[PDB]
């Protein structure tokens, strides 16, 4: 077998087919049915295809392997292995050239549009009912003229010569050979230069592309017509002899026999010179037989002999699920594997696993035999089986000897992420259960309640090495999703440690001074001192402050005995402070974090193991239990309940009198009950938490209690405050089916007893919860499957592309404070360019450097706010990404290595965690800082307010040391108090505006003048008396009256004299087209003040994430501006009002249709910026990408997804979402010209290579400007370049025909192709292999 790549597909020429074939099959007979020896040329022939049985001739003269080239004199069969009879192909020489059904009848008829003649006509021709005049020389008839019988007759009699017409695939081949490719191509290009109409231009461009595909690939059309037909090896269409003289045969045998029969009958008829009609009928019949062979089902459906079932053609074997690919290389059962239940086994090391004897023997059986034979304990293999089935001591010794370093793979049924499969070293144990190390359970999501686990054995040596290096448990401590440790202690360990570190006011051995931890242990273990008691101890901590040297600092600290006992394990490098605290879940996690970051892997591993052992031991010594008295009912519960009941009774009686609606009463009751619940919860937590008032020597004191349930709560081992409440408080309000909340809550708790109603309600609750979880899991699985499918092929191919591009990343400060800081957001990304201190020429970070913890810390002491970092989306590399643009983050710490398939890890990391996802009047500065306004242009009025005239105005907050803490968006018309520079005290009201009201603010004073403000047609004067009330209504486009639909009323602001007063600094005559719902309250006759109100203008979780990733237009998209400049109205009331954006500089002709219902937020005579909001609502990603560009859409996607994910408190690094987005926009659409067809959707890769070519060519071209496109992951995956990956799941016939005609070349470049072809994936360990082969080409 050759080591290949680049699988090439093209039309087979008849000479190549002759090349493959080894012989002609002349007669259809196979075997004599009497003596089961095969016949001569037949369909089964030993001299043509091969010997039936390995290395033995038919007559039985030669049977030994010694003979390999001899050809028996009696039977002319050569002696070789029967396997060759499986690969040798034959051929049949057809007398009449026959058409290939696939390339003719396939839905887009490539013969059809290539000849630009419809399919109906081709069918009409093929069945011989009418002729067609093909190149009828110098007469008055065209090339696709249909001819009837007697019209053909009178034509022949009139035109003896200059009349050439024919029938069938030979006629079609004649038409194809004589067609002039280049003349028609150039004519078509001229026509396209002259023609401007959509559908004809599309059919023409498709056709020109087809012709171009032929002229580059080099396939000539005549090969679509078959002359020689190959015949499949016999063993793939067997004719097995059933016991009982009967035979069983595949349908291919029947089809071949029928084809050969019909061919031979046609041969004789030709030799007999039969009339044309009969030979035509026979040629048609041969057509049905052949096309039934190739693809049965596009004709009269030739059924088989005496069976009424349609016979299976070649296409059926290839195409379809049951046939091949879709099932063949998709999900199989493997060997050397077992399955059983998992168990704890605390005594194990982190890198090992308990394995039952009997399973180990069964798995490693062949290893056992090999080693037993090597040691000579057994003469032969059968003796090895007998000795293993007796199971003597030698067998266990050999098994122990082979097992030492051999690792096994453990897998748990739902492998959500890559930590679902890990390798361990087995330790033989008794029993039938697998023993699993506790720390890794969190990674597996394993639970000991009957969960089972599977165990695989890697066979080859490379697999063993891969398991020990890449997959071993100790090498995978950091989650690939986020950087934090996965193996953190879970529940028992943390409880034990918590018990160990907590101190008590007074105990045994108070205040004695110890020389070290060793005598602390002496004291505790001998019972001369309590495990927790405050003491002065001398301790020597080590610090590697120098360049890797450890300096001992030795002093007296005040701690507990327990903390010292714990200190024994702690590795050298860590500061003592680390253990000095209460040491809960978080504390332990951050301890492990620091230990890893400072020391490295191995010390962290050993330290984690030590932590486990000590935690388990001292938890057991603690003796923590749970008694009925451990959960204390708060003493003041009953009072709270009686008070709340009295209050609900008073509110209900005051309802029966009818001063409050039903809904209002509902709201009041629900709120008062919620308040009572919070009160009782807080009272219970106060009672239980710090109730231990124990006494020291003299007076008394109080301390954090030793209530066992409280320790289980506070340590973070199990339970949350909510469950404590659910045990000892009232279990809050419940929701009915529809989501509405029951008026009376459940006042009882599980310590007490519920009654029928309350129980029933909670039953409903739990049922709904579980069903939700079920459906959520199904939806998750579906989403993650799509994700992993679409992004599989992306691989890190290059080290550095060398681009300067990058994205400016800032900390996302949503409103009140810094939800997520910079340091975590930037850790492990390379910088796009050096960032400067707040003072120029103070470079803080050289050109691209990997930002590890030390650089990040350096950035917090300074005040860098925003950092431009290289992102994967902007990466320049072709066909993959470069290491630098990606960054470091991995289960290991260092920069990414060339070759790892980041697409799949990203898809898994985004998918697996997805299974637990279900007024604004005044601004209030939270922290004392300076206020700063961004993107605003205000005009101070007479009242002394900084009037906001921009809709996109932002108000950020600079702190003392130059950092933006808070950020708010201030709308148009919000009353302001402080401007710029002013320091605002804590929680001081800086702004004011009406929540459900946006006022329109006048800048100047004077009298209101009516322009196009006619009474009655478009407005209805409903005015009140002297005090100046009115109901003048300037209605919007939808709500405008029927007469005043197109007449737009306006208000010019003139002064007392008449002249329109102009806005300060601008000459524009203020002509305010009153917007929708302009309630003109202040009628004509009141000098307008600056600020009169002109017009009052009034899902999440898994479906939301799936929707973001499928890019679905949300049915009410907001509208944006393309260019800036004066907008204007246009041809009025066609059914959708026209808005034409007029650029002050640019060209005018941009029209946007607007529905009637739409209300506009901007005035006509307003200064818009590009991409400003015109209507309110959710924006569809396409517009943002088109206008603002790539970085805007990527930021948009990342923020909306990361919001959903953080709402549930699951941390994911942005790089994965970035990789997905990069995979999403692979395609572009060409807008200019020069080398493409001026509109074809083409991948950005081909565009980049062609631009590199053109611009490299000195003459080159003007060059092809393009526009990006965004496609949804399902369709985007469906638009896969590889023909193999497309065939893997869609209609196989179509893509196979398309790639065959196009001559497409697949470099396989991906995962799925390599799987299908059965070679090494180009990722990871096999990358080198492929790298080797790449080095193998163009080398010595």
């Amino acid at each position: 077998t050759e080591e290949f790549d680049a699988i090439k597909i093209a039309l087979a020429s008849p000479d190549m087919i002759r090349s493959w074939s080894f012989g002609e099959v002349k007669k259809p007979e196979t075997i004599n049915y009497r003596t089961f020896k095969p016949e001569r040329d037949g369909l089964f022939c030993a001299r043509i295809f091969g010997p039936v049985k390995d290395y033995e001739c038919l007559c039985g003269k030669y049977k030994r392997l010694k003979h390999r080239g001899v050809i028996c004199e009696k039977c002319g069969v050569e002696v070789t292995q029967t396997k060759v009879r499986r690969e040798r192909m034959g051929h049949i020489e057809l007398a009449s050239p026959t058409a290939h059904i696939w390339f003719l009848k396939s839905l887009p008829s490539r013969i059809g549009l290539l000849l630009d003649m419809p399919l109906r006509d081709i069918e009409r021709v093929l069945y011989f009912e009418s002729y067609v005049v093909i190149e009828g020389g110098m007469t008055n008839l065209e090339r696709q003229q249909i001819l009837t019988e007697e019209q053909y007759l009178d034509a022949l009699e009139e035109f003896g010569d200059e009349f050439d017409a024919k029938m069938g695939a030979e006629a079609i081949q004649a038409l194809l050979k004589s067609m002039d490719l280049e003349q028609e191509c150039e004519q078509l290009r001229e026509e396209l230069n002259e023609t401007n109409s959509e559908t004809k231009r599309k059919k023409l461009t498709k056709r020109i592309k087809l012709l171009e595909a032929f002229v580059q690939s080099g396939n000539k059309p005549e090969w679509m017509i078959l002359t020689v037909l190959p015949v499949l090896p016999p063993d793939l269409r067997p004719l097995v002899p059933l016991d009982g003289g009967r035979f069983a045969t595949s349908d291919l045998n029947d089809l071949y026999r029928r084809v050969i029969n019909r061919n031979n009958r046609l041969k004789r008829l030709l030799d007999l010179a039969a009339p044309d009609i009969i030979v035509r009928n026979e040629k048609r019949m041969l057509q049905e037989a052949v096309d039934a062979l190739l693809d049965n089902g596009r004709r009269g459906r030739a059924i088989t002999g005496s069976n009424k079932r349609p016979l299976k053609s070649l296409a059926d074997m290839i195409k379809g699920k049951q046939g091949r690919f879709r099932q063949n290389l998709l999900g199989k059962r493997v060997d050397y594997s077992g399955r059983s239940v998992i168990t704890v086994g605390p005594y194990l090391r982190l890198h090992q696993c308990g394995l039952p004897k009997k399973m180990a023997l069964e798995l490693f059986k062949p290893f056992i035999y090999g080693k037993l034979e090597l040691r000579g304990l057994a003469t032969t293999i059968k003796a090895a089986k007998k000795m293993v089935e007796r199971e003597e001591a030698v067998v266990w010794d050999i098994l122990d000897e082979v097992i030492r370093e051999h690792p096994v793979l453990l897998n748990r049924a739902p492998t959500l992420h890559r930590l679902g499969i890990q390798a361990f070293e087995p330790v033989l144990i008794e029993g039938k259960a697998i023993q699993l190390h506790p720390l890794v359970c969190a990674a597996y999501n394993a639970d000991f309640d009957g969960d089972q686990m599977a165990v695989h054995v890697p066979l080859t040596l490379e697999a063993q090495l891969e398991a020990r290096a890449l997959m071993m448990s100790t090498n995978n401590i950091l989650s690939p999703a986020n950087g934090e440790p996965i193996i953190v202690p879970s529940q028992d360990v943390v409880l034990g440690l918590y018990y160990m570190t907590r101190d008590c006011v007074n105990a045994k051995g108070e205040g004695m001074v110890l020389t070290g931890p060793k005598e602390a242990e002496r004291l505790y273990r001998s019972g001369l001192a309590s495990l927790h008691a405050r003491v002065k101890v001398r301790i020597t901590e080590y610090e590697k402050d120098a360049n890797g040297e450890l300096v001992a600092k030795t002093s007296l600290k005040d701690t507990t005995v327990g903390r010292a006992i714990l200190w024994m394990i702690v590795p050298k490098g860590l500061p003592y402070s680390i253990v000095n605290q209460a040491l809960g879940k978080k504390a332990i996690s951050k301890m492990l974090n620091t230990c890893y970051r400072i020391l490295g892997l191995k010390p962290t591993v050993i330290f984690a193991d030590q932590i486990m052992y000590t935690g388990f031991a001292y938890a057991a010594r603690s003796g923590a239990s749970v008694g009925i008295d451990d959960m204390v009912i708060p003493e003041k519960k009953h009072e709270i309940i009686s008070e709340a009941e009295a209050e609900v009774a008073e509110i209900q009686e005051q309802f029966q009198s009818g001063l409050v609606t039903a809904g209002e009463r509902y709201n009041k009751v629900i709120d008062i009950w919620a308040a009572a619940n919070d009160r009782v919860s807080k009272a219970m937590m106060d009672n239980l938490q710090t109730e231990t008032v124990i006494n020291r020597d003299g007076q008394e004191e109080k301390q954090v209690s030793f209530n066992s349930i409280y320790m289980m709560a506070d340590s973070g081992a199990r339970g949350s405050a909510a469950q404590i409440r659910q045990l000892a408080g009232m279990r809050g309000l419940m929701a009915k089916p529809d989501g509405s909340i029951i008026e009376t809550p459940i006042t009882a708790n599980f310590r007490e007893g519920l009654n029928v109603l309350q129980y029933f309600i909670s039953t409903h609750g739990a049922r709904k919860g579980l069903a939700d979880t079920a459906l959520k899991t199904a939806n998750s699985g579906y989403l993650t499957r799509r994700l992993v499918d679409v992004a599989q092929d992306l691989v890190v191919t290059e080290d550095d592309c060398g681009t300067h591009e990058g994205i400016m990343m800032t900390p996302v400060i949503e409103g009140g404070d810094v939800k997520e800081p910079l340091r975590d957001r930037v850790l492990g990304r390379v910088t796009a360019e050096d960032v400067l201190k707040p003072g120029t020429a103070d470079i803080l970070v050289p050109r691209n450097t990997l930002l590890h913890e030390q650089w990040c810390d350096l950035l917090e002491e300074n005040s860098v706010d925003a950092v431009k970092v290289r992102s994967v989306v902007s990466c320049d590399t072709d066909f993959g990404v470069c290491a630098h643009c990606y960054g470091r983050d991995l289960a290991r710490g260092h920069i990414i290595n060339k070759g790892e398939a980041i697409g799949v890890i990203a898809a898994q990391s985004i998918g697996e965690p997805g299974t637990q996802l279900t007024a604004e009047s005044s601004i209030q500065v939270k922290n004392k800082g300076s206020i700063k306004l961004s993107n605003v242009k205000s005009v101070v009025n007479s009242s002394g307010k900084l009037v906001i005239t921009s809709r996109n105005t932002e108000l950020k907050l600079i702190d003392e040391f130059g950092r933006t803490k808070e950020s708010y968006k201030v709308p148009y018309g919000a009353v302001l108090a402080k401007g710029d520079g002013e320091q605002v005290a804590g929680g001081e009201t800086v702004a004011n505006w009406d929540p459900h009201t946006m006022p329109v603010i006048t800048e100047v004073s004077g009298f209101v003048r009516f322009t196009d403000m006619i009474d009655g047609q478009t407005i209805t004067r409903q005015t009140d008396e002297l005090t100046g009330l009115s109901s003048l209504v300037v209605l919007d486009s939808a709500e405008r009256t029927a007469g005043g639909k197109d007449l737009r009323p306006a208000l010019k602001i003139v002064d007392a004299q008449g002249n329109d007063v102009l806005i300060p600094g601008t000459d524009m005559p203020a002509q305010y087209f009153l917007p929708g719902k302009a309630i003109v309250q202040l009628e004509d006759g009141v000098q307008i003040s600056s600020g009169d109100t002109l017009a009052r203008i009034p899902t999440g979780g898994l479906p939301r994430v799936a929707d973001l990733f499928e890019a679905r237009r949300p049915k009410e998209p907001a509208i944006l501006a393309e260019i800036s400049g004066i907008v204007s109205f246009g041809k009025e009331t066609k059914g959708k009002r026209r808005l034409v954006i007029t650029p002050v500089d640019g060209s005018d002709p941009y029209e946007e249709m607007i529905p009637k219902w739409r209300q506009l937020n901007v005035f006509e005579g307003e200064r818009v910026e590009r991409g400003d909001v015109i209507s309110d609502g959710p924006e569809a990603p396409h517009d943002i990408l088109r206008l603002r560009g790539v970085h805007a859409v990527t930021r948009y996607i990342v923020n909306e997804v990361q919001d959903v994910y953080r709402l549930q408190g699951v941390k994911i690094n942005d790089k994965h979402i970035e990789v997905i987005v990069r995979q999403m926009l692979r395609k572009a659409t060409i807008v200019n010209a020069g080398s493409s067809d001026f509109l074809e959707g083409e991948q950005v890769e081909y565009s980049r290579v062609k631009i590199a070519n053109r611009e490299l060519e000195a003459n080159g071209k003007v060059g092809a400007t393009y526009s990006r496109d965004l496609l949804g992951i399902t369709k985007a995956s469906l638009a896969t370049e590889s023909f193999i990956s497309a065939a893997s799941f869609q209609e196989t016939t179509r893509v196979l025909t398309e790639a065959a005609v196009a001559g497409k070349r697949d470099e396989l470049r991906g995962l799925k192709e390599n799987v299908i072809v059965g070679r090494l994936i180009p990722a990871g360990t096999g990358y080198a292999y492929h790298q080797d082969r790449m080095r193998r080409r163009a080398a010595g």
């Binding site: 890198h351 030492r404 191995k602």
Partner: protein, 69 residues
Amino acid sequence: ARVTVQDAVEKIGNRFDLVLVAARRARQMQVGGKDPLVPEENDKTTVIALREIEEGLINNQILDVRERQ
């Protein structure tokens, strides 16, 4: 058992062709064409080859020079 290969990956930073060179070495060791340069402690040949890699005696270039020699 050799619980971490961190030093071997620090020798060759790709962390993938590490597996290839170690496989070639351990395959020369199992089919007894060659001999281990490190005193074995009852390890199998995989962990032996990793132990040899981490000590700096073997890499791809040493393999190539020794093979042509």
